[PDB]
């Protein structure tokens, strides 16, 4: 039906498109744009473009594996079950050429799909059409039709012409990069994990193509007595035995290992070996690079924590701090950050208000709801108050509050025991969920009892500067607390 | 005794657990949670889980080394001293299967142990039970009992079935990663040093397994005349000579070196060689990646210092500063930072108050205690004052204070000689521990003598803005200094 | 003509020079400086220096490829068509020696061209003249003229003397680094892409030189029976067959692959092999390093985004946030940043005012021009206002404004639907380009209706603190809005 | 003389020591500390310790190269010219053992030299004395004296005992790391360049030791017919031919290349080959890691600039900015930063006042000295003023000032032409060194003429907020400018 047929060629309302265009109305604006052409635009983000590129990737990985092998290890590439594969697949890759004249293009420099037919055709014919046409049209069977209008020379030249189909790797690279830019925008794949699998796919393909080339150059020379295929006496081995050996040569030049049974004798086998070493050791260097980037991404937060701590050790050693105090600072960072690197002030500034308020109310509303100041207060005021709490960790023996010091802030216990070392009583061990220093906010005096950490206290603290900064926003609660 | 027996299965009060749950009361809350099941939960952080996984790791590293070798290089894996090892160890790995149906699970996405028996069993049977059961139960001896209900075919198939025990590597990977996540939370091991030793352990194991596989595939084919074992004439060498050669092949494919005495002749030896090259050169790329991450972590602070300084050189060169002044800025950074990278303002903001106050009193109380302003003052006031000191380094010939300039700050000497170049006297060389500019805080006038660095002075400075900011916090001392 | 001839030797008015000196008048000041010498200065940035170094690079890459080969694989380097190349090229490299005595020098430590003839000559004769003179003057043909004033010993020693021409690689390294420092300042090439192509060029050259050396040391020994050239029976193969094999040896020692057909027999072939392995595996390690740096530069922004997000996951897990809220924070970062890392506050502070104002007016003037407050206002006021807008993203179900809350800021919709959930009406779905909370700026009251995100809203927000901060700058508009 | 003899053992007054202790008085305090012991302390930073470790490093690199070779490739290590080297060198390494009982120790955890004799002896005997004593005392000649109190077994065992001298590598590692920690604190060597040369030195040594070991294990077995030395028929080749081959084996296992002429036949040669591959490929992985760290340090500032710019491209693409404006922002960053990364605000905050003032007066005093406001003002006031200048770059066509806009800041031209596009006159092209907007500071009105960039202006700007902030510091100049 024509409505569903047109619907496939437009950018759909889906998790990607509503994130790329930012609203379902901006998606509809782009659909209403695509409706300008006489079906002569399919959008780069359309379901048609997706499923077409998906069947093109499985078509093209299959074809870029099968074509090197059928051109290299098989006689009679003019046979019915082989020309049926090549005419069918070159039809699919010619439909794909026609589709790219009507396919838009994602202009990264303007963040817009070009999406107009004369602009798409003129940019495409200037960008990639020559490699796409050469790799699309059956130039090998065209040359057989011209030559039928010498047999060993025709079978030589048609094998080189048939490897112009390998320029489908330009489309494989392109359609993979387009669909991976789209899939990062859909699934947040780790960059180095996408990149290592691009390169593992490229290594396997270039290793496979070198594996074919290592036999093809012997074959195009009619297996001279000084090439490895003749020296290994395997010019008449099965296509699979030959391919396995030829691949093993290429793979040994790739993965940095060796040769076949001998160093190359003939100058063409020697130069194809050097090319395959250059391509191979380039791939393996590129793969050690991607493996390194993968590894450095996978522990990146732990690596950044230990880099940050090493700057604490550099601070400690610059100031020549005693080993007893350096151990105290180490044990502080171990309890304050738990080996995790973040900036709370940075991250909370990157969030919206509702999401700060949800994070803050999950962390701190359980601590504050026990306090008689806040158990009876308005939910909007308490939500504004909890955002002013500063998290503090006190190691055992640290005085959180000292008797006779000015009451600049008051505290709440998330975890640990804090002993109220009062001037005329036994030490009341305030356990997790307790609160203290509360007379600082109401009375503006010096503290009436010291409070010291009896374990590694994890505290939330409320400065009287920040308390008053929030009470200026809620004068109804200010007049209420002023009653007591 | 039942109390001690139950006590092992709960999360203990230890350096890890009191840091993971954050308080001894939150540990007790988790112990009181674990008491819900009828012994049918042991906690993922329990001493039982630890010592069970510890004896499982030494059991499993031993077993994953011994099983490949006994299946590959030995005849008669049905013999008494071999079935005793396999029935005993498969009992231990079946107790371990049963233990995982009652073992909780650390849910990283919620930072909670799942710790309920129907939730643990349903998540486990959906996650890992198939690989754990196949690797637990003696499928090789089960197949011998079924087959006893052809001998060369049975001895072929039972060796492949017996390598289903190698799926204990899933448990080895898991129990190592669990105990290393726990040990980072206990000992702060360097991330890349833990990771390099995971991979060195994995390389040795995969090299050992490839070493076995390289002989096993020849053996399962009954040593055909075109495999390396037959070509090396070593089908009847000792198990140790065979293992050493087979390992050397695998290790040469791993560490990027070569083959045995020849490139592979038979297609199965050729493909097991290609598999071992792919696995091997993958491992070595992963190991160059981890070696690089280890190296970049080990000098990370020096690397970050020289990156920061290179931005000072980029600033100097952007501004086209004279080489004489660039050398002056270099010698300044050399004395100001001593090649150490830190941010004092960032690090002091990450600490608690008691730990800032201890660091500050260690650095600066020796400098300030000589001053007549502070030798007679209250310890709380001086501790508040010392935090306002800013560290400054003056190179020789730098005027710290100029005669007739406004007295915006006053100084204390940590190190170096600063000459008071007075307008009517000889230059009094103020040595380390001296102080100057002190009339700025009391008198609010322009300076009565210039002071210039005669060496690389390291100074602490007290702005009169920050002095007054601290005196507003201690009006009793403000009225006292106002007396003189 | 003398004016055009002098004009080539001065720093031109071009995209590089007007950026290096910063103005066409500072370029003219440097041209007027260069006019001090009697043509005895050509400037390091001059068109003469450029085109001279350009023809010197193509001369020198050609010569450093051709000289090793003609000295190694050819007899009779005293022949007419070979001495014509060497006398012509050594003339060009002697003109280049003379040009460097009159060429200035870019002093990186002062960001100034030294550009005075006695200072240039005295610095050059102290820096590089010995390597440049030895590589310039035909020391090989000088020695033949002295020796004509024994033939196998003369043909030995003249080949070693002729490889003193390979010290032109010092000039190749220098002129490449000078022109790449200039080209970074002209085209912003990716650092690692310039560096990888330096090293690929250096690898190809050192592989080529090792390839020559591997044959040259056999040749200088008159091909002893224990060197690879004699063992391969190829002392009489064509120069191209020999070069291809000798290169293949060197390339296999470089790219970590193997040897020739045998491990080296004679001690000189063995030590040249060890030298070529040390040089080769040094190059390949340097190339894996540059490949890694290239890869880590190419995905650097995605890598930095996933590092930043992993710190959000570390924050979430430190605070033990529920998996439901962690997913909410993930979906927030996905819509707030779209996988892109930047700091808007940092980047806008790095720009000038006109460029902030152009970026801000492109982003926000389409959103504000619908509002009745701003459709009728002055372009300078609106441009000042739009800079105070803060971008906020609200996930579906997030209340942007709550009824009865204080109106601290008002909003504009870039994208998404926000429902006005009014206390006495149906939910008016405000679509993209709408605005709400507008009574907050005029009336200073609590909000009269709640507004909640019905999709992922992308909003611009205007705090009443920042609105009043901008209206203090435009009192004419302040008195106008005070009318309504 | 006893004063000079004692003087060598104390920490001298030198560029390192005056930077490590921070003052010549703190150096004297450490010298006065060292005077506590009865010559039984030499300080870890002393000239004696330096020159002793310097002659120990050249002694020890020589010895750790010569001992493997003399034990491996030479008969009769009991001969006069060999026992003279070993008794002399083992005397030097026994004096060094005695020196370490009186040598202090740099405690990195407290940044103090331990420098007391019972504390030094007790820490040393617990830390390194066992490896130092075993490697110091002639255990090989002790065993010959005991055995003289069987000849092939004695010559076997004495070679293994003599390689206990190779535990001098513990001292080589230690004394290199101590002197490189001291030399970073003296010369600011690039971290990765020091580290790559540690590892190149370690690779050469381990390659040399493997090269010896590869022959030594054959020799200790009396050259069995299945080891490479016997298969290569070279048990009677010269020591140099054997060493060159044995080294080549080890070096090929190190640099990832191959074997000797064959894969190993005997199980001991096979296992020494596997050990040498494990050690070798570990070294090469460690060396690719250090090469990568060296490369990533060498372009680190350019890499950081292109990372920062890529965040500007991520900002531009997140905001979907037009390609015309993205090019404008690119050309802005190219002129604003010139491809150089720094933070001016960060770097100027890290400096002292005199060095900020020197940098600022070099940059800006030439620009301000033309202005009639500042040509007649006091040097202290102008130096305070120039620090308030903010550098701004305006691209051509950018309006710096607009007619009728409020005069919030005034400008000075460092470079470029800015046209005063006056409302009633021809465009006065203000060239480099001019100033404009000057009526903003005196008159507080809207601008009387627009000023637009006619080239890429580089400007210094003075906000009237910052002008008034500086004039509050100099009321004498405030009352003077108030006269006009
Ligand atoms: C005889 C010597 C035996 C020694 C046994 C020690 C066993 C300890 C193993 C711990 C393994 C582990 O702790 O876990 C490492 C996670 O593994 C990793 O880090 C990285 C894994 C990399 C493996 C790549 C395989 C590539 C495959 C290609 C297929 C075609
Ligand atoms: C003939 C040529 C002789 C040359 C002698 C030069 C000696 C200078 C040595 C300084 C060593 C050093 O300065 O210290 C480097 C710290 O060492 C390092 O950086 C990294 C050490 C890496 C070694 C890995 C061994 C792996 C083992 C496996 C066992 C199975």
Swiss-Prot record, chains A, B, C, D:
Q: What keywords tag this UniProt record?
A: cAMP, cAMP-binding, Cell membrane, Disease variant, Epilepsy, Glycoprotein, Ion channel, Ion transport, Ligand-gated ion channel, Membrane, Nucleotide-binding, Potassium, Potassium channel, Potassium transport, Sodium, Sodium channel, Sodium transport, Transmembrane, Transmembrane helix, Transport, Voltage-gated channel
Q: What organism is recorded for this protein?
A: Homo sapiens
Please give the name of this protein: Potassium/sodium hyperpolarization-activated cyclic nucleotide-gated channel 1
> Record's domain comment?
The segment S4 is probably the voltage-sensor and is characterized by a series of positively charged amino acids at every third position.
Q: Name one GO molecular function term.
A: voltage-gated sodium channel activity
Give the membrane topology.
Multi-pass membrane protein
Q: What is the effect of changing residue 203 to L?
A: In DEE24; absence of hyperpolarization-activated currents; highly reduced amount of protein at the cell membrane
Q: Known consequence of changing residue 289 to C?
A: In GEFSP10; affects channel gating properties as the half-activation voltage is shifted to the hyperpolarizing direction
Gene name? Answer: HCN1
Residues crossing the lipid bilayer are 50-71, 81-101, 123-143, 159-179, 194-216, 270-290
Glycosylation sites noted in the Swiss-Prot or TrEMBL record: 236
The shown range, given as first to last of full length, is 94 to 586 of 890
Q: What is the lineage of its organism?
A: Eukaryota, Metazoa, Chordata, Craniata, Vertebrata
Q: What is the effect of changing residue 50 to Y?
A: In DEE24; uncertain significance
Q: Which residues lie within the membrane without crossing it?
A: 243-264
Question: What is the protein's quaternary organization?
Answer: Homotetramer. Heterotetramer with HCN2. The potassium channel is composed of a homo- or heterotetrameric complex of pore-forming subunits. Interacts with KCNE2. Interacts with the SH3 domain of CSK.
Please provide, in alphabetical order, the Gene Ontology terms of the cellular component aspect for this entry: apical dendrite; axon; axon terminus; basolateral plasma membrane; cell surface; dendrite; dendrite membrane; dendritic shaft
């Amino acid at each position: 039906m024509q409505r569903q047929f047109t619907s496939m060629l437009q950018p759909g309302v889906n998790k990607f498109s509503l994130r790329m265009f930012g609203s379902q109305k901006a998606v509809e604006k782009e659909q209403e744009r695509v409706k300008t052409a006489g079906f002569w635009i399919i959008h780069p983000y359309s379901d048609f473009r997706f499923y077409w590129d998906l069947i093109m990737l499985i078509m093209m990985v299959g074809n870029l594996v099968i074509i090197p092998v059928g051109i290299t290890f098989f006689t009679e590439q003019t046979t019915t079950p082989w020309i049926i594969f090549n005419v069918a697949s070159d039809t699919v890759f010619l439909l794909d050429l026609i589709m790219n004249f009507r396919t838009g293009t994602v202009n990264e420099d303007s963040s817009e799909i070009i999406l107009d037919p004369k602009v798409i055709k003129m940019n495409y014919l200037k960008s990639w059409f020559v490699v796409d046409f050469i790799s699309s049209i059956p130039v090998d069977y065209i040359f057989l039709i011209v030559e039928k209008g010498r047999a060993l020379r025709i079978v030589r030249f048609t094998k080189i012409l048939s490897l112009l189909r390998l320029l489908r790797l330009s489309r494989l690279i392109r359609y993979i990069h387009q669909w991976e830019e789209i899939f990062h925008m859909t699934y947040d794949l780790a960059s180095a994990v996408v990149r290592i699998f691009n390169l593992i796919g490229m290594m396997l393909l270039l290793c496979h193509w070198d594996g074919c080339l290592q036999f093809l150059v012997p074959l195009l020379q009619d297996f001279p007595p000084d090439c490895w295929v003749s020296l290994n006496e395997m010019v008449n081995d099965s296509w699979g035995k030959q391919y396995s050996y030829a691949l093993f040569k290429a793979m040994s030049h790739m993965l940095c290992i060796g040769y076949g049974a001998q160093a190359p004798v003939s100058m063409s086998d020697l130069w194809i070996t050097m090319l395959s070493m250059i391509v191979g050791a380039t791939c393996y260097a590129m793969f050690v690079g991607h493996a390194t980037a993968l590894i450095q991404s996978l522990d990146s937060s732990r690596r950044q924590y230990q880099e940050k701590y090493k700057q604490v050790e550099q601070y400690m050693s610059f100031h020549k701090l005693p080993a007893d105090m350096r151990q105290k600072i180490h044990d502080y960072y171990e309890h304050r950050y738990q080996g995790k690197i973040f900036d709370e002030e940075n991250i909370l500034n990157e969030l919206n208000d509702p999401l700060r308020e949800e994070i803050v109310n999950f962390n701190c509303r359980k601590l504050v709801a026990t306090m008689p100041l806040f158990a009876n207060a308005d939910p909007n005021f308490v939500t504004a108050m909890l955002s002013k709490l500063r998290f503090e960790v006190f190691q055992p023996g640290d005085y959180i509050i000292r008797e006779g010091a000015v009451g600049k802030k008051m505290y709440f216990i998330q975890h640990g025991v804090a002993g109220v070392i009062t001037k005329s009583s036994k030490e009341m061990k305030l356990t997790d969920g307790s609160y203290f220093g509360e007379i600082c906010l109401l009375t503006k005096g010096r503290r009436t009892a010291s409070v010291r950490a009896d374990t590694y206290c994890r505290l939330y603290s409320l400065s009287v500067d920040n308390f008053n900064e929030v009470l200026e926003e809620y004068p109804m609660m200010r007049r209420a607390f002023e009653t007591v």
